[PDB]
Design an enzyme around this catalytic site. Structure first.
Site, short mmCIF file in Angstrom:
data_model
loop_
_atom_site.label_atom_id
_atom_site.label_comp_id
_atom_site.label_asym_id
_atom_site.label_seq_id
_atom_site.Cartn_x
_atom_site.Cartn_y
_atom_site.Cartn_z
N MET K 25 -35.79 12.64 18.82
CA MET K 25 -35.55 11.31 19.36
C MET K 25 -35.29 11.42 20.84
O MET K 25 -34.55 12.29 21.27
CB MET K 25 -34.32 10.67 18.71
CG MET K 25 -34.17 9.17 18.95
SD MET K 25 -35.58 8.23 18.39
CE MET K 25 -35.25 8.15 16.65
N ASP K 49 -29.67 0.43 37.37
CA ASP K 49 -28.55 1.17 36.79
C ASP K 49 -28.60 2.58 37.38
O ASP K 49 -29.65 3.19 37.42
CB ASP K 49 -28.76 1.14 35.27
CG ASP K 49 -27.58 1.61 34.48
OD1 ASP K 49 -26.71 2.40 34.96
OD2 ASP K 49 -27.57 1.18 33.31
N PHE K 82 -27.81 17.57 33.69
CA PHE K 82 -29.11 17.92 34.21
C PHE K 82 -30.00 18.30 33.02
O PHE K 82 -29.55 18.96 32.06
CB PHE K 82 -28.90 19.10 35.20
CG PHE K 82 -30.09 19.99 35.39
CD1 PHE K 82 -30.34 21.04 34.55
CD2 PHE K 82 -30.96 19.78 36.43
CE1 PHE K 82 -31.45 21.86 34.71
CE2 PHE K 82 -32.08 20.60 36.61
CZ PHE K 82 -32.32 21.64 35.75
N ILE K 85 -37.85 19.06 31.85
CA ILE K 85 -38.92 19.15 30.88
C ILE K 85 -40.10 19.62 31.67
O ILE K 85 -40.38 19.06 32.72
CB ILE K 85 -39.19 17.82 30.17
CG1 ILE K 85 -37.91 17.31 29.52
CG2 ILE K 85 -40.26 18.02 29.11
CD1 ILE K 85 -38.11 16.07 28.65
N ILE K 86 -40.76 20.66 31.18
CA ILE K 86 -42.01 21.16 31.74
C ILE K 86 -43.12 20.84 30.75
O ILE K 86 -43.01 21.09 29.56
CB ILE K 86 -41.90 22.69 32.01
CG1 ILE K 86 -40.87 22.93 33.12
CG2 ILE K 86 -43.26 23.28 32.41
CD1 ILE K 86 -40.45 24.36 33.23
N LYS K 93 -45.05 29.74 33.06
CA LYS K 93 -45.76 30.12 34.28
C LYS K 93 -44.89 30.54 35.42
O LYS K 93 -45.42 30.99 36.42
CB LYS K 93 -46.69 29.00 34.75
CG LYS K 93 -47.75 28.70 33.74
CD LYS K 93 -48.82 27.81 34.30
CE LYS K 93 -50.01 27.81 33.38
NZ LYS K 93 -50.71 26.52 33.55
N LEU K 130 -31.62 32.52 30.90
CA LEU K 130 -32.28 31.98 32.09
C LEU K 130 -31.30 31.18 32.95
O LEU K 130 -31.24 31.35 34.18
CB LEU K 130 -33.50 31.12 31.71
CG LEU K 130 -34.60 30.79 32.76
CD1 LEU K 130 -35.80 30.09 32.14
CD2 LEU K 130 -34.13 29.93 33.91
N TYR K 131 -30.50 30.31 32.33
CA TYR K 131 -29.58 29.49 33.11
C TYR K 131 -28.44 30.32 33.66
O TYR K 131 -27.99 30.06 34.75
CB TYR K 131 -29.04 28.32 32.32
CG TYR K 131 -30.07 27.28 31.95
CD1 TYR K 131 -30.68 26.49 32.92
CD2 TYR K 131 -30.39 27.03 30.62
CE1 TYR K 131 -31.63 25.53 32.58
CE2 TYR K 131 -31.31 26.05 30.26
CZ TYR K 131 -31.94 25.32 31.24
OH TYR K 131 -32.87 24.36 30.89
N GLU K 133 -28.78 33.38 34.65
CA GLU K 133 -29.43 34.00 35.80
C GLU K 133 -29.62 33.10 36.99
O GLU K 133 -29.77 33.57 38.10
CB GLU K 133 -30.77 34.59 35.40
CG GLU K 133 -30.54 35.97 34.83
CD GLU K 133 -31.68 36.47 33.99
OE1 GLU K 133 -32.85 36.37 34.42
OE2 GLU K 133 -31.38 36.98 32.88
#
Ligand SMILES: [Ca+2]
Ligand SMILES: [Ca+2]
Ligand SMILES: [Ca+2]
Ligand SMILES: [Ca+2]
Ligand SMILES: [Ca+2]
Ligand SMILES: [Ca+2]
Ligand SMILES: [Ca+2]
Ligand SMILES: [Ca+2]
Ligand SMILES: [Ca+2]
Ligand SMILES: [Ca+2]
Ligand SMILES: [Ca+2]
Ligand SMILES: [Ca+2]
Lengths: 171, 167, 169, 169, 172, 170, 170, 172, 169, 171, 167, 169
Positions: K25, K49, K82, K85-86, K93, K130-131, K133
Site C-alpha cells: 500500500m 501542505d 526520508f 525509490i529507485i 547501478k 548501506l545506510y 555506511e
C-alpha cells in the site's frame, strides 16, 4: 531598449516566473509562500483581483522572456510601493536594467500616481547600489543583518525616490 | 502584574476602540478598515495566516492595558515588525518599558526571532529616545514614508538583534 | 459644535440611514444600487462591506444623538478624488452644525484618506446652500444642465470642488 | 461611412479592448475596477455581464476591421443619463470616423436606450476634440479643475453634454 | 385621508400581505411566481429583493394601522412603464382612502421613478372602480376579452392608463 | 408553406436569434431581462432553461434555411393565455410565409399547450400588418397609447387576440 | 360547516401533517418522495417550496382546531387535472365535515385553479366512502387491481372523477 | 424480432429521444418536467441521473440502428408498481416489433426490478393498440374520461395492467 | 405492552441514541460510518436524512419514557430484504418488552415497508436471545464464524431470518 | 478511578483542550498547526469525519475536566496508533494516569481492534518511562536529540505494547 | 550527472508506476491510494501542505531514475523522515549512495534540518548496512511496526544529525 | 495463469465494467447504489473515489487483455472483513483462470490489506461453483434462504468464508 516592452503578467507567464526562482532563496505571491508550480498557479487565481502587487513581464522584439518587474506592498493612502526587478541570467550584463528601472518608475509615477518607490539592495552588491543611485534613488536605511543570503546574515540598503524628483528633476 | 494573551474574536472591540483613539487608518493583515464590521470580516478572513500576531496586555485584575503586535513576520529570516498600543487611560504610567521587555522576551526566547524592528515618527523624539533606552538602534530614516495627519512624515526604523537582547 | 464627531458606519446605524433617506423623497443608492426598504439596504450593506468605492460616517454629538451622515462616493484612488454629500437629520437642521460637518468631512478626506480633490452637487435652486459651500472654500467648476430629475422635473446643479492644496497649505 | 457599424461587445472582442488600452498609457477600468492583464479583464467581463450600468459596442467596417469602441458608463435609469467615450484604434484615426461614431453613440443613446442626457469629458488641452463635440451639438457645462491624473500631472477637462430634446428636434 | 403614508414594504409586512390574499380568494403572484403559503411568499421576497421589476408599498395611518398595499409590477426602464395595483384591507374599505393612495402611487411613479406611463386592470363588472379610476385621470385603452379566469369564469377587464405629462403638467 | 417546419429553439440557434434582434434594431428581452451581448443572451438562456413562461420555435424550410422565430411569452397556466410574437428574417419577408407561421403557432398554442387565448401587439403605424392579423381571425381589444419607446418615440400598438374556441370550431 | 376554513399549509402545520400520517399508519409521500421522520418531511418541504405540482390546505374551525388536510397532487397544467385526497383527524371523523371539505376542494380546483378534472382513489373495501363520493358527483372510471400495498396486502381502489363543467353547470 | 436488444439509455441517445418527440407532436416529459428543446432534455437527464423513479431503455437491432424506446415511470418500490410506455420510431413501425419490446419491458420489470404490477395508458380511439396490449396479457382496469388533452380535444384512455404473478407463473 | 409505540427517529432523539451507544462498548455506526462523538453523530444524521438504506424508530411508553431503538439497515429494494437489530435501554430490560418490539419491527417490515425477508445477527454465546428469536418465528440460516470483534475476541454469530410469507399466514 | 470516565471529545471541550496548551510547546490538530482558539475551532469542524485521530475527555464524578486521552496516526492496515495523555496540572500527583492508560489501551485493543500502540516519553523523565514500563510498554527506541524541550535537544523513548500482550498477558 | 526537481502534476504517472513495482500500500500525505485516479485526487487535495516534499531524480538526459521523499516534516524540531525509490531498471547501478548524498545535502544546507531519519526492514540487512555506511546510526528497532507481505515486520529506525553530516 | 495480474481500477476501465455487468442480467451496484447506464456508473465512480468501503481490481493477462474483475465490498476495518466477488468476461470463462483469480484476491486481501475474514455468496443452484470455492479453502457458514431475487424467483445462496489464519499459516 527600443526593442524592449513591458506587459502585464498573465497565466501563461507563470512557468517563466517559476524558472526565475530556480536561479536561487524562497519566492512569494501576495506574501503567501510557494515552492511548486501547481502551488503558484493556485495562488495566481486567488489574487487576480488583489491590487497590492503588480507584475510585468519583459520581452524583446522576438518575444524572448528577458525578466520581471514587480511592485509590491502597494499602499494607496501612503501612495508607496516596493520595487523589485529580476533579469534572466542569460540576459544580464547587456545594460537592459536602467531602461527597465525607468519604465517601472514611469508607470509607478505617471499612471498609478504613487508618491514614493523604495527598494532593497544587498550592501555587498556595491554595483547594484551605485546603479540605483545613478537612477536617482537615495539611501534611507542600512538594514543590519536583514536577510540570510549565502550562509550568513547580511546588511541591505533600502533606497527610495519620490514622484516630484522623478517627474520634476529637470525643472 | 501584567500578562500577554493570544488575541481572539472577543478582543475585537478593544482593538477597534484602540484604533479610534489614534485617528489614523488602521490595518489588519495590511488591509485597511474603519468600522467594527469591517474588522470582524477581516479577522475571519485571516484566522489561518501567520504573517501577524497579536497579544492582549491585561493586568492581574483583567483590565485591558494595551496591545502587542508583530507584523511582517518572516519565518525564513526570522524577523518581525513590532508595535505597541497602550490604552489612553494607561499612558504615562510606566507600563511601556515593561511591555517592551515582555515582547522582546517572547520574540527572542519563544518565537526564536533573530531581529525585531519598529517605526517611530521623527516628530516623536521622546518615543525614539525611549526605544534607544530599551536597546534599539536606528538603522534607517525613512523619508516621507507615511501620510499622517495631512502630510508625509519621516520615520526612524529602529531594531534590536537576539544576540544583543540575550546578554 | 466642538463636541460633534464622525464615526465609521456600523450595521446598527442602518435604521438611522433608512430613516434619513425617508423624509428626503428622492431615490437613494448604496454603491450605485437603488433601494427603498431597510431590508434591501441591509443586504447591500453586507454585500459591499469591503468595497472601498464608498465610505460613510455617522455624526453624533456629546451624548451620542444621531445628527447626520457624511458619505464619500465615487472614490478613485489613482485620481485621488471623491464626491461628497452631507445629510443632517431634519430635527437638527438650522442649528449651525452644517459648517462644522463640512469641515470634518474635508478634514477626513484630506488628512486621513490623502485625497486630492473632493467635489459635490448642489441644486441651483438652493442658492443659500451654494453660498454655504463657497464660504467653506468650494468653487464652482460646472453648472450641470438638467442633471437630476427631482420633484417631477429635471434640475440644474452646481458642481463645486475643493483641492487638498487649498484646504491644507 | 455608413460602411461603419456598431455591434454589442462580447468575449471574442476582449483581445481588441486589451490591445487598445495598451496604446493609451493610463489606467483602464471595467465597471470601475482597474485592470492590467487580459486575465483580469476576462474575469471582470464574466462577473459584470448582467450589470446594466455600462454598455459597450465594437465598431467595424465592411471587411470587419476593428476600428474602435463606444462606451456608455454610469448609466442611471431614474435620471436617464450616461457618460460616454469613444476610442478609435491608432491606425484608423484622422480618417473622419469620429463624427460618424459620435452620431451612432447618440442615436443608440436616444432612440434605443431612451436616455435623456449624454455627457463626456474632453481634455482642455485638446481644443480640436472640444470643437468636434461642439459641431455635433454638445455644449460645455463644466470645466473640471485638476480632475484627472494623466501623463504625470493633474489636468482640467471640459464636461460636455447634449440632451435628448435637442438631438430629436 | 390626510395622514396616510407610504412606506417601502419590509419582511415584517409579509404577514399583512398574506392576510390580504387570504381575504381575497384569487391566486396571487410575486415576481410572476404564484404562491399560496406565507412560507413561499417569504422565500420569493428573499430571492427577489434586488429585483427592480416590481416594487411594493405599505399604507399606514398615524396610529400605524395597516390600511393597504400599492404594487407596481412589470416595470420596464426603457419604455418607462408599469402596471399598478392597489389593495385596501376589508375593514378600511368604504372610508374613501382609494383616491389618496392612487395619488401616492402616481406621485411616486412619476416623481421618484420618473416613469412615462402607468396602467392597470379593472374588472368590467366593477363599473364603480372603472369610474373611480376615470376620475383620477385614467383613460380606457383596452377592453380585454376573457382575459382572466376569476370565480369560475373568464371575465373581461378594462385596461386603463395615465401619462406622466398628464399627471405632472395638467395644471401648467 | 408545406415545407415550413417548427422546431424548439436550441443553443445552436442563439446566433440566429441574435442576428435577428440586430436587424430589428430595437432592444430585446429574454424572460423579461434585456440583453444586447450574445454572451448575455447565452447566459440568460442557461439560467432560464427550465422556465416555462416563454417558449420559442425556430422556423425552417426543407433545405434548413432559417426563416424566422415564433415566440410565446407571458404564459400563464391559470388564465391559459400567452403573448405571441413572430419575427421573419429580412430576406424572407414578403414571400407569403407569415400566415402559415401564425397558423402553426395558433395550432401549437391551442391543440398542444391547451391555452384559452393568444394576444399580440402590432404597431398602429403598420396597418397592413394589423389587417393581416384580422384576416387570420384576430380581433382588436385594445389600442395601447404610447406603450413602447421604439426608434426615438413612444408608439401606440394594437392589442389583438384570438380564442381557442374560435380557432378550433372553425 | 359555515365555520370550516381552508388555508395554505405552512411550516407550523407540518407537526399536524406528521401526526396525521402516523394515525393512518401507511407510508406517506411529499412530492412523490417517501418520508417517515419529521426531519425528512421538513427538508422535503423546504426543497419543494416552489414546486406547483402539489398544493395543500389545512382545515380549521372557528376556534382554530385542526380538522384535516386537503391535498391536490399530480397537478398537470396542460391536461388541467389533479389527484385529490382528503385526511380528517381521527377525532373529527363522522361529524359531517367531509362533504363540506370536498366541496371546498372542488371549489378551489374549479373556480380558482381552473382545472378541467379532479380524480381520487378510494379503497374498494370502503364502499360507504365510495357512495359518499358518488353523492358528491364523482363517477367511477376505474377499478385499479392490487394498486396499493396497504396493511400487508395489495388492494384494489376505485378511481373516481368529476369534471369542471359538471361542477360549475350544477 | 429475434435480434433486438435493450440497452440502458445514455447521453448520446438523447438526440434519438428528441427526434422521437419531434415526430410525435405531443408534449413530452422527463421526471414530470415538460420539455421541448434538446438542451432542456440534456439538463434534465443530468439532473436526474440518480433518480430511480424513472428508467429508460433504447432498442437496437444487430446493426445498431435505433428502433425504439422503453420507459418505466412513476416507479414506486413500496407498492412495487410502474407505468410503462413504448415508442417505436416511424420508420420501424409496422414490422411487428412491438410484442418483442413489450416482452422485454415486462421481463425487466418483473425479473430484474422485481416489481409487482405494470400498467399503461392507451387512447380509446386506438383499438388496435388496446387489442395488442390485451394479447400480451394486459387487462382493462379503467376507462379514464377526458384524461388527456391531445390534438385539440380531451380524449379518453384505457388503463391496462398486468401482474408479476401472471407474467411469471401463467405457465407453471 | 400495547402501551409501547414506535415513532420515526428525529433530531431530538440523537442524545438518546448517543447515550445508548455509551453503555454498549463497541463501535457504533450511522449508515456504515463509525462515530464516537455527538457532533460526529449530528453531522452524519444531517448528511443521510434522505438516504433510505437504513431506518430507525424510537420506542416509548404511555409516559413517553425512552425504552429503546428499532434499526433496519442494509435495506435493499430489489431483493426486498433488511438486517434488523433491537436495543433496549439497560434500565428497561428483562421486563418482557423484547418480544413486543420484535413483533412491531416485523409488522412494520412486512405490512408497511413490504419487505420479503428480515434477518439479524445474535451472539452464539447468547442462547437465550437465540431462543427468543426462535419463539418469534425466526429460523437459523447461518453460523458465522469469527464474524465480529467484540470484547477483545472474534465471535461467532447466528444469522436468523423470517420471511414475509411466514409472518402473514 | 471508579469516579473517572472517558467521553469522546465534542465542540464544547475545545476551550479546555486550548487551556491545556497554556501549560506549555506547540499544539496540532490532525497534524495542522494551531495557536489561537478560533483557529482550533475551524480545524475541529474540518476534521470531524477524519478517522486518523481520536480524543477523549476525562471527567470525574462532578464533571471536572481532568485530562485528555489522544490516539493519533491511527493506521488501519498496520493497525497501529500513537498514544498521548495529558493531565491538567491541578489534577496530577493523584494516581489517575495508570487507570487512564488502561482505559485507552482497552479501547484501542478491545474496540478498535488495533494491533500495536506506541508512545514517546522524554528520556529525562525517568518516572514517566518507568510508569509506562509498569503498564507493559517495552522500549523499542532511544530517539537521539529528537525534540527541542527547554532550550536544548533531548532524547526520547519510544515504547510499545501489542494487543496479544495486553489481552492475553494473563493466560 | 543526476538532478533533483520539485515534483509536479506531470510526475504523478511516474510515482504511480513506482508504487506498482513494490506491491504494498502506498500513501500520499498519510492517506492510502491504489489507482492513479485516487492519487490525482490526493495530489490536488494536498497541494498547499508542507508536511511532505518530493523530488524527482532525473539524469542529464531526462531519464527518470527515482524519487526522493521527505515526510513527517517537522518545522519546529527541524526533522523529517526520508525515503528513496529507485526505478527497477536503475537498481543496483550505484545511484543509491549518490542520491542519499544529494538528499542529505539539500536537507541539511538548504532546508536547514537538524535531523533526518528513516525506516529499513530488519529483513533487509543489506539496506541497513548501506545506510550505516552513509553515516546513519540505529536509534530504534521497531517491533512488528508494519504489515508487509502478509505478516508484521520489524524495522530499524536510522538517523543522522546535521552536525555529523556537515563534517 | 502465472501471467495474469491485478491492477487497481481506473476511469478508463469503466467501459469494461459496464460491458461485464451487461451479459449478467441482474442489477448491479456501485457503493450500494443501483445502476444501469455507463453514465450513472461514471458518476458513481467519481462520487465514491475516496470511499474505502469497496475496492476493485481489473484482471489482465500478459498482453493486457481484460479478463475479469475482482471486487471487495462491505469492507469493515474494525472486524477486518469484506465480501467478495469475481466476474470473468464470458469469452475467457472455462479456461482455468478462476482458481488463479480467487488466489490473487485472497492474496491481496490477506497480504496487503490485512483483513481477517473474506466471505462470498454462491447460488446453491451452482454446485460446481460451490465445489470450486471449497477447493480454494472456503467453508460453508450459511445457507441463506430466498436471499436474492434472480431470474424471476427467490434463490438460496451458500455463504462461504475463509480466515487469514488459514490462508497464511
Ligand atoms: Ca507586507
Ligand atoms: Ca433595488
Ligand atoms: Ca460610478
Ligand atoms: Ca408556487
Ligand atoms: Ca442586460
Ligand atoms: Ca411578464
Ligand atoms: Ca425517505
Ligand atoms: Ca407523480
Ligand atoms: Ca420546461
Ligand atoms: Ca503523521
Ligand atoms: Ca441508480
Ligand atoms: Ca452495506
Amino acid at each position: 531598449n527600443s526593442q524592449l516592452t513591458l506587459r502585464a503578467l498573465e497565466r501563461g507567464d507563470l512557468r517563466f516566473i517559476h524558472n526565475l526562482n530556480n536561479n536561487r532563496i524562497m519566492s512569494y505571491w501576495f506574501e503567501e509562500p510557494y515552492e511548486s508550480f501547481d502551488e503558484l498557479e493556485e495562488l495566481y487565481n486567488k489574487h487576480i483581483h488583489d491590487n497590492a502587487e503588480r507584475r510585468f513581464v519583459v520581452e524583446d522584439a522576438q518575444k524572448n522572456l528577458i525578466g520581471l518587474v514587480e511592485l509590491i506592498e502597494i499602499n494607496y493612502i501612503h501612495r508607496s510601493a516596493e520595487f523589485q526587478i529580476i533579469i534572466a541570467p542569460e540576459h544580464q550584463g547587456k545594460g537592459f536594467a536602467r531602461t527597465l528601472i525607468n519604465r517601472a518608475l514611469d508607470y509607478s509615477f505617471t499612471i498609478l500616481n504613487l508618491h514614493k518607490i523604495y527598494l532593497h539592495v544587498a550592501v555587498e552588491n556595491p554595483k547594484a547600489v551605485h546603479l540605483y543611485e545613478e537612477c536617482g534613488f537615495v539611501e534611507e536605511g542600512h538594514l543590519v543583518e536583514e536577510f540570510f543570503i549565502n550562509g550568513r546574515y547580511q546588511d541591505v540598503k533600502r533606497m527610495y525616490i519620490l514622484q516630484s524628483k522623478y517627474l520634476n528633476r529637470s525643472e
